[PDB]
Amino acid sequence: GHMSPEREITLVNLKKDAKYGLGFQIIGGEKMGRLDLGIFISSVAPGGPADLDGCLKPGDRLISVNSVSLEGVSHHAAIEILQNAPEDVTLVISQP
Amino acid sequence: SPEREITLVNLKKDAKYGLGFQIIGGEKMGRLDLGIFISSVAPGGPADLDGCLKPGDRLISVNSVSLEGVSHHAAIEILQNAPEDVTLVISQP
Amino acid sequence: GHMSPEREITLVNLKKDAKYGLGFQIIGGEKMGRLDLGIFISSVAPGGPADLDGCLKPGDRLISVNSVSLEGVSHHAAIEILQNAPEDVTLVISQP
Amino acid sequence: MSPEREITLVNLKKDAKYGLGFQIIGGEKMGRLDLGIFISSVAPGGPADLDGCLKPGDRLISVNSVSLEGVSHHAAIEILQNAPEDVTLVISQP
Ligand SMILES: [Cl-]
Ligand SMILES: [Cl-]
Ligand SMILES: [Cl-]
Ligand SMILES: [Cl-]
């Protein structure tokens, strides 16, 4: 027997908008090295793709941008990865 | 190209092999810790025949249930108690 | 590219870096039988000694550090063995 | 209660009369990552004996680059037999 796990993984499918991009901002970065997932959603822009989809929320943990893992990624590099992502993006996130 | 990769793996348990892999990890997990990894993959088993899962891969979820904060002991039970059809989210080098 | 019934044994020669150390992390349990080998590679840092050498990968099994066997060695003790190792390290590992 | 064990690489050459000059024991039903092969005897005057390192009780971990993880006693014998004349063993010792 064990304590029931609390969190879930979700796949969020978004399309970049010329005006919004993906319509969210991030906070954080790795501190503990290669396996550290330190990136979280800091805000979701009203009327943007993430908002309209409805799933992504401030506080959610960002695990991947399509297949690109954010494990061990700095804040700077995470910004880069999001910027360089194609128009069609699936975010793997964990949620409370 | 330095980033790791996130992949989804769909497996069906087999009578002899189960899912066809073993896991390792500690028992003390912080709420957001992901400490479950693959230690071996059985030749002939579903994981092997599927071809994606490898030793060293990091197990992130089982049928959408996150392994964040989940101990090795709890993860074994989750995998053993899982239905025949499982979708795994993993990270890979 | 499926798993082989026979695994592989490999020697890896690394030099510690002042910032990276050996450039990898390990995982394993704390309870070990005297002959158990429960230590495995969990990550390899891009640009670190292990990465540049190109042999060591996550999932590899750590068998010795400069002839010191990991048999019966707990995760906490293995970390200490890697920390206490000199600059020039020879690893014996097993690989899938 | 006993110090860390020691891993050694032993370089031997097969001999026409002695082979490698040692025998092994172990079970047949190994798990994937089990290492259940051990040295049982070392022949006086054969390669292993002359080399001086290998002793009965030692654990045999590999034959050249072939791991004995999950390898049965039967299969280990065949791995040793099939090996070329130049052989490197990885062993563990007390
Ligand atoms: Cl394996
Ligand atoms: Cl690392
Ligand atoms: Cl890695
Ligand atoms: Cl012994």
Swiss-Prot record, chains A, C:
Positions of the PDZ domain: 11-96
The entry's note on the tissues where this protein occurs is:
Expressed in keratinocytes (at protein level). Present in most tissues with the exception of the liver and skeletal muscle. Most abundant in lung, kidney and fetal brain.
Any signal peptide, and if so, which residues? none
Enumerate the subcellular locations listed in this protein's record, separating them with semicolons: Cytoplasm, Cytoskeleton; Nucleus; Cell projection, Lamellipodium
Q: Which domain of life is it from?
A: Eukaryota
Q: Which family does it belong to?
A: Belongs to the protein-tyrosine phosphatase family. Non-receptor class subfamily.
> What does this protein's UniProt record list under function?
Tyrosine phosphatase which negatively regulates FAS-induced apoptosis and NGFR-mediated pro-apoptotic signaling. May regulate phosphoinositide 3-kinase (PI3K) signaling through dephosphorylation of PIK3R2.
Q: What does the subunit section of this Swiss-Prot or TrEMBL entry state?
A: Interacts (via the first PDZ domain) with PLEKHA1 and PLEKHA2. Interacts (via the second PDZ domain) with TNFRSF6 (Fas receptor) (via C-terminus). Interacts (via the second PDZ domain) with TRIP6 (via the third LIM domain and C-terminus). Interacts (via the third PDZ domain) with NGFR (via C-terminal SVP motif) and PKN2 (via C-terminus). Interacts (via the second or fourth PDZ domains) with PDLIM4 (via C-terminus only or via combined C-terminus and LIM domain, but not LIM domain only). Found in a complex with PDLIM4 and TRIP6.
Protein name (record): Tyrosine-protein phosphatase non-receptor type 13
**Organism for this UniProt entry:** Homo sapiens
Gene behind this protein? PTPN13
Curated annotation (Swiss-Prot), chain B:
Tissue-wise expression = Expressed in keratinocytes (at protein level). Present in most tissues with the exception of the liver and skeletal muscle. Most abundant in lung, kidney and fetal brain.
Q: Where in the cell is it found?
A: Cytoplasm, Cytoskeleton; Nucleus; Cell projection, Lamellipodium
**Domain PDZ spans what residues?**
8-93
For this chain, the family text in UniProt reads: Belongs to the protein-tyrosine phosphatase family. Non-receptor class subfamily.
- What job does the chain carry out? Tyrosine phosphatase which negatively regulates FAS-induced apoptosis and NGFR-mediated pro-apoptotic signaling. May regulate phosphoinositide 3-kinase (PI3K) signaling through dephosphorylation of PIK3R2.
Subunit structure of this chain's protein: Interacts (via the first PDZ domain) with PLEKHA1 and PLEKHA2. Interacts (via the second PDZ domain) with TNFRSF6 (Fas receptor) (via C-terminus). Interacts (via the second PDZ domain) with TRIP6 (via the third LIM domain and C-terminus). Interacts (via the third PDZ domain) with NGFR (via C-terminal SVP motif) and PKN2 (via C-terminus). Interacts (via the second or fourth PDZ domains) with PDLIM4 (via C-terminus only or via combined C-terminus and LIM domain, but not LIM domain only). Found in a complex with PDLIM4 and TRIP6.
Protein name listed in UniProt: Tyrosine-protein phosphatase non-receptor type 13
- Species name for this entry? Homo sapiens (Human)
Q: Which gene encodes it?
A: PTPN13
Shown residues within the full chain: 1086 to 1178 of 2485
From Swiss-Prot, chain D:
Limits of the PDZ domain:
9-94
**Where in the body, by tissue, does this protein show up?**
Expressed in keratinocytes (at protein level). Present in most tissues with the exception of the liver and skeletal muscle. Most abundant in lung, kidney and fetal brain.
Q: Superkingdom of the source?
A: Eukaryota
Q: Where in the cell is it found?
A: Cytoplasm, Cytoskeleton; Nucleus; Cell projection, Lamellipodium
On subunit structure and binding partners, the annotation says:
Interacts (via the first PDZ domain) with PLEKHA1 and PLEKHA2. Interacts (via the second PDZ domain) with TNFRSF6 (Fas receptor) (via C-terminus). Interacts (via the second PDZ domain) with TRIP6 (via the third LIM domain and C-terminus). Interacts (via the third PDZ domain) with NGFR (via C-terminal SVP motif) and PKN2 (via C-terminus). Interacts (via the second or fourth PDZ domains) with PDLIM4 (via C-terminus only or via combined C-terminus and LIM domain, but not LIM domain only). Found in a complex with PDLIM4 and TRIP6.
Biological role stated in the UniProt entry: Tyrosine phosphatase which negatively regulates FAS-induced apoptosis and NGFR-mediated pro-apoptotic signaling. May regulate phosphoinositide 3-kinase (PI3K) signaling through dephosphorylation of PIK3R2.
In the record, the note on similarity to other proteins reads:
Belongs to the protein-tyrosine phosphatase family. Non-receptor class subfamily.
The protein's name in its UniProt record: Tyrosine-protein phosphatase non-receptor type 13
Species of provenance: Homo sapiens
Question: Gene name?
Answer: PTPN13
What stretch of the parent protein is included here? Answer: 1086 to 1178 of 2485
